[PDB]
Design a protein around this motif. Sequence first.
Motif, PDB file in Angstrom:
ATOM      1  N   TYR A   1      -1.169  19.189  -2.961  1.00  0.00           N
ATOM      2  CA  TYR A   1      -0.916  20.306  -2.212  1.00  0.00           C
ATOM      3  C   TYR A   1      -0.889  19.639  -0.731  1.00  0.00           C
ATOM      4  O   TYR A   1      -2.212  19.608  -0.381  1.00  0.00           O
ATOM      5  N   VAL A   2       0.012  19.264  -0.020  1.00  0.00           N
ATOM      6  CA  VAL A   2       0.054  18.423   1.187  1.00  0.00           C
ATOM      7  C   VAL A   2       0.575  19.396   2.442  1.00  0.00           C
ATOM      8  O   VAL A   2       1.529  20.005   2.263  1.00  0.00           O
ATOM      9  N   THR A   3      -0.419  19.379   3.379  1.00  0.00           N
ATOM     10  CA  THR A   3      -0.108  19.762   4.755  1.00  0.00           C
ATOM     11  C   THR A   3       0.867  19.061   5.752  1.00  0.00           C
ATOM     12  O   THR A   3       0.369  18.531   6.948  1.00  0.00           O
ATOM     13  N   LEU A   4       2.171  18.604   5.493  1.00  0.00           N
ATOM     14  CA  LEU A   4       3.122  17.992   6.229  1.00  0.00           C
ATOM     15  C   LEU A   4       3.605  18.660   7.590  1.00  0.00           C
ATOM     16  O   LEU A   4       4.071  17.993   8.244  1.00  0.00           O
ATOM     17  N   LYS A   5       3.513  19.654   7.401  1.00  0.00           N
ATOM     18  CA  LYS A   5       4.002  21.010   8.448  1.00  0.00           C
ATOM     19  C   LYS A   5       5.400  20.978   9.109  1.00  0.00           C
ATOM     20  O   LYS A   5       6.029  21.691   9.552  1.00  0.00           O
ATOM     21  N   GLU A   6       6.326  19.926   8.441  1.00  0.00           N
ATOM     22  CA  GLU A   6       7.708  19.692   8.911  1.00  0.00           C
ATOM     23  C   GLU A   6       8.627  18.931   7.400  1.00  0.00           C
ATOM     24  O   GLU A   6       8.151  18.370   6.843  1.00  0.00           O
ATOM     25  N   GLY A   7       9.750  19.410   7.613  1.00  0.00           N
ATOM     26  CA  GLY A   7      10.776  19.010   6.298  1.00  0.00           C
ATOM     27  C   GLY A   7      11.581  17.474   6.403  1.00  0.00           C
ATOM     28  O   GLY A   7      11.460  17.132   7.549  1.00  0.00           O
ATOM     29  N   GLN A   8      11.630  16.908   5.124  1.00  0.00           N
ATOM     30  CA  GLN A   8      12.228  15.546   5.050  1.00  0.00           C
ATOM     31  C   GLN A   8      13.112  15.470   3.845  1.00  0.00           C
ATOM     32  O   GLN A   8      12.494  15.539   2.854  1.00  0.00           O
ATOM     33  N   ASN A   9      14.359  15.422   4.302  1.00  0.00           N
ATOM     34  CA  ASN A   9      15.489  15.157   3.291  1.00  0.00           C
ATOM     35  C   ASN A   9      16.446  14.034   4.051  1.00  0.00           C
ATOM     36  O   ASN A   9      16.440  14.035   5.150  1.00  0.00           O
TER      37      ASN A   9
ATOM     38  N   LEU B   1       0.724  -1.033  -0.009  1.00  0.00           N
ATOM     39  CA  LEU B   1      -0.024   0.178  -0.146  1.00  0.00           C
ATOM     40  C   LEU B   1       0.952   1.084  -0.012  1.00  0.00           C
ATOM     41  O   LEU B   1       0.437   2.304  -0.586  1.00  0.00           O
ATOM     42  N   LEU B   2       2.029   1.185   0.626  1.00  0.00           N
ATOM     43  CA  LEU B   2       3.152   2.153   0.843  1.00  0.00           C
ATOM     44  C   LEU B   2       3.805   2.616  -0.395  1.00  0.00           C
ATOM     45  O   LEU B   2       5.082   2.831  -0.477  1.00  0.00           O
ATOM     46  N   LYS B   3       3.112   2.981  -1.495  1.00  0.00           N
ATOM     47  CA  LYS B   3       3.743   3.620  -2.896  1.00  0.00           C
ATOM     48  C   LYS B   3       3.067   5.008  -3.082  1.00  0.00           C
ATOM     49  O   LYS B   3       2.615   5.416  -4.099  1.00  0.00           O
ATOM     50  N   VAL B   4       3.202   5.725  -1.846  1.00  0.00           N
ATOM     51  CA  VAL B   4       2.588   7.032  -1.535  1.00  0.00           C
ATOM     52  C   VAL B   4       3.592   8.286  -1.528  1.00  0.00           C
ATOM     53  O   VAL B   4       4.643   8.099  -0.817  1.00  0.00           O
ATOM     54  N   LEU B   5       3.302   9.434  -2.199  1.00  0.00           N
ATOM     55  CA  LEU B   5       4.260  10.513  -2.254  1.00  0.00           C
ATOM     56  C   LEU B   5       5.682  10.534  -2.912  1.00  0.00           C
ATOM     57  O   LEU B   5       6.246   9.416  -2.904  1.00  0.00           O
TER      58      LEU B   5
ATOM     59  N   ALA C   1      -1.429   5.758   5.306  1.00  0.00           N
ATOM     60  CA  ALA C   1      -0.197   5.635   4.453  1.00  0.00           C
ATOM     61  C   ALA C   1       0.937   6.219   4.723  1.00  0.00           C
ATOM     62  O   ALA C   1       2.110   5.768   5.020  1.00  0.00           O
ATOM     63  N   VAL C   2       0.739   7.526   4.852  1.00  0.00           N
ATOM     64  CA  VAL C   2       1.698   8.618   5.304  1.00  0.00           C
ATOM     65  C   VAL C   2       2.020   8.327   7.004  1.00  0.00           C
ATOM     66  O   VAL C   2       3.312   8.389   7.070  1.00  0.00           O
ATOM     67  N   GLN C   3       1.161   7.967   7.574  1.00  0.00           N
ATOM     68  CA  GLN C   3       1.384   7.668   9.071  1.00  0.00           C
ATOM     69  C   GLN C   3       2.253   6.207   9.169  1.00  0.00           C
ATOM     70  O   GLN C   3       2.675   6.317  10.577  1.00  0.00           O
ATOM     71  N   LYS C   4       2.331   5.423   8.280  1.00  0.00           N
ATOM     72  CA  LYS C   4       3.348   4.421   8.321  1.00  0.00           C
ATOM     73  C   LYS C   4       4.490   4.449   7.527  1.00  0.00           C
ATOM     74  O   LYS C   4       5.497   3.711   8.108  1.00  0.00           O
ATOM     75  N   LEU C   5       4.782   5.346   6.608  1.00  0.00           N
ATOM     76  CA  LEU C   5       5.663   5.168   5.726  1.00  0.00           C
ATOM     77  C   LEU C   5       6.682   6.455   6.167  1.00  0.00           C
ATOM     78  O   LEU C   5       7.820   6.431   6.290  1.00  0.00           O
ATOM     79  N   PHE C   6       5.942   7.484   6.568  1.00  0.00           N
ATOM     80  CA  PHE C   6       6.677   8.700   7.156  1.00  0.00           C
ATOM     81  C   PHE C   6       6.329   9.045   8.492  1.00  0.00           C
ATOM     82  O   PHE C   6       7.169   9.877   8.983  1.00  0.00           O
TER      83      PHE C   6
END
Lengths: 102, 77, 46, 93, 63, 50
Positions: free
Chosen positions: D84-92, D7-11, D46-51
Amino acid sequence: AAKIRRDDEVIVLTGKDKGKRGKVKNVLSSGKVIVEGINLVKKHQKPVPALNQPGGIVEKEAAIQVSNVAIFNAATGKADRVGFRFEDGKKVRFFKSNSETI
Amino acid sequence: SRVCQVTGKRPVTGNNRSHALNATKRRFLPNLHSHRFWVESEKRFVTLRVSAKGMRVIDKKGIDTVLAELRARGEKY
Amino acid sequence: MKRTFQPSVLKRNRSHGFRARMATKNGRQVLARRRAKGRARLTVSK
Amino acid sequence: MIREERLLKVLRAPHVSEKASTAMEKSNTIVLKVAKDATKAEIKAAVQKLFEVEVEVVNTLVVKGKVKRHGQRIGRRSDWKKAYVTLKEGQNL
Amino acid sequence: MKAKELREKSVEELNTELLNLLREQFNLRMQAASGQLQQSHLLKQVRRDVARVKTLLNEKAGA
Amino acid sequence: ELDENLFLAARNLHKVDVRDATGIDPVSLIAFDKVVMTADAVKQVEEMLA
RNA sequence: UAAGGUGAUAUGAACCGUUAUAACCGGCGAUUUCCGAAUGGGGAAACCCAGUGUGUUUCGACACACUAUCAUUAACUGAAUCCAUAGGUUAAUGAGGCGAACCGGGGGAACUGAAACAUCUAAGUACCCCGAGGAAAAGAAAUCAACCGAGAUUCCCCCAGUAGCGGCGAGCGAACGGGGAGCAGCCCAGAGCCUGAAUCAGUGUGUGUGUUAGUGGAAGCGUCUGGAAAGGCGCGCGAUACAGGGUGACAGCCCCGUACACAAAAAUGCACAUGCUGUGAGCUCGAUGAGUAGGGCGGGACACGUGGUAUCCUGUCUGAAUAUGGGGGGACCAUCCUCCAAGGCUAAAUACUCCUGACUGACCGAUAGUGAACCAGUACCGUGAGGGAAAGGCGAAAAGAAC
């Protein structure tokens, strides 16, 4: 089997200046070799977008046909045809002229 | 279709050839009337594709042999 | 004047679209003659 | 049990947008790519499990693929999903 | 990864995708966008070897 | 004459071919100069022309 | 098999190196999203929406295995109707769609030629539909013959523009017989004796024959003219190889190619040997080809327009004999000869060229040769099926724009 590649030196047969061992700087997929200490081309090239510079040229070495160059024979200062896979033992170039490498 | 199945007949081409002798078509068509039978080989009664002067052949071959030949010709009864 | 040709593609798709030709005997032959010519505009109509 | 992690083929990768890349890209909103096949049905989990973060609001669109490049015959961008995603924090990484 | 294992039974090799590659498989997605990894060997090592276990999973229903 | 192996070549030398007496061609007797027909082949050709 | 390579236009970071799967390529496998035969079912082509089977609740249906259709065969289910059948279902087997031509069948023209036109002819040809094998198709005598013989078929050269048909006109044209390419023959209409013998088939394997991925393959220099030599001079060297492409002017000795020699872990076309598994030879005694043949009526096809019309076919009429029997020998009668119909298989000479491999031109050279040597079946024309352009070769080398 393919000839010249990049590791050997050439004696030159084409209409360029002769009398020196041409060292192969690079080999091209166009069927040419770039040889150092043999010939030069001028090329002034496109100017830079800002703003006032001195005059100068690139002056770079020329490419020639990989099929009209012949490899230096490492025995008598000349070029010789070499032949492929000797008639005995290990898989090596025949070196027809004197039967010796390098 | 105009197929009779029991005698295997087909319509055939044919020319008029009557006075004043024009080369016009006329054709010939065979007949098909269909009929209901009791056969004893079955617990039920059956209907077969059959024609006038064609039921004369059933008397030659035997009804069970025609029931088997029309089965080999793929007929639904 | 009006040159017998309206703006409407719904009127074209229902006869000359892939589903309107591939389902019919002669339309599935237009598709075969198109391929046999080498023509890139196989049916268009969308 | 229930579902496997396929399922985790997201963003996909971030992109530039004046709605995010100006003052919000590490504090509220970020504009991302999305794969040709990916969930819009369980995207909040899915974002709650992958990110391992929660998103309050997310809408997905394509706008328009441009076709005017390198012609010759003119080359296309096609439609591809943008979010247009409201993630509120950066990821690199 | 092997693509053929004689009578070793592939039902136990699906775990390679569902647990052992997990939380590292495709992890550069969204988290890296430059293309400048400086490990151009590692990006080739995380490819094709995971396909050899999929060639081996062809017989996974055997018992 | 016709040999088990030596029935072909010279060719690339130009204006040349090797040929036997069977079906001897008139072009070979004029399209070239002094033919190498032997003192025994002149006897063989007399029996093929009667 | 090689040192440059992660496709290319396009470089480069980083990394594999330069021997051990850097990179590339061949045999034979794994696979191959969604629409399309298209095949759960449906739509405004790539979308939406269901079922049966397997497993399950970390808890608003996942994720794997399967489901289209015809007939045959096999097994479920199931009325009036008791048995039965009709209806309702699943699955394997062969087919399905796209081809190029060759190839079997169904329906089937008219311009035209007869300087017109009705019979004749255009022609069972075109065209539209269907089928089917690597070839199809044909065939093993109720065939032909002529009182003598041939002894299954196919094609080529003939027989012959003859015997002959025909508003006797335009057209159309045999048959016997001969030369050649070529030539194992065999099973049923049943069931005994005795066996698995003849002759094959499928796949495996061995062997031969062909085609392979691949590797090797002979000789030259300086000087001169010039921008530069493949040409001149000095003369040497090689040749089954001085075909072809060439290359900075004309190359056998520079490159690719050519004549030639080798090579295959292994695949695959052909033919034998042979294991496995299906097939099953001979002799004896039965069975022995029926709505068929003969013969009318009306037509078709046979060269043949029904005529002296046999032959082959049959809408329609009549309808046997089955070996004191029956067909044919171009009406019919007689005699004589010659065969035994109304059941199948099948060599090879033959047809064609998508395709593989070898190869050539007293042919064309960009208004030619294909419409197309090139982002051409594109641009463009049209509602559409369909119609359809203009466009080739700098120089040795970008040395091609410093200041």
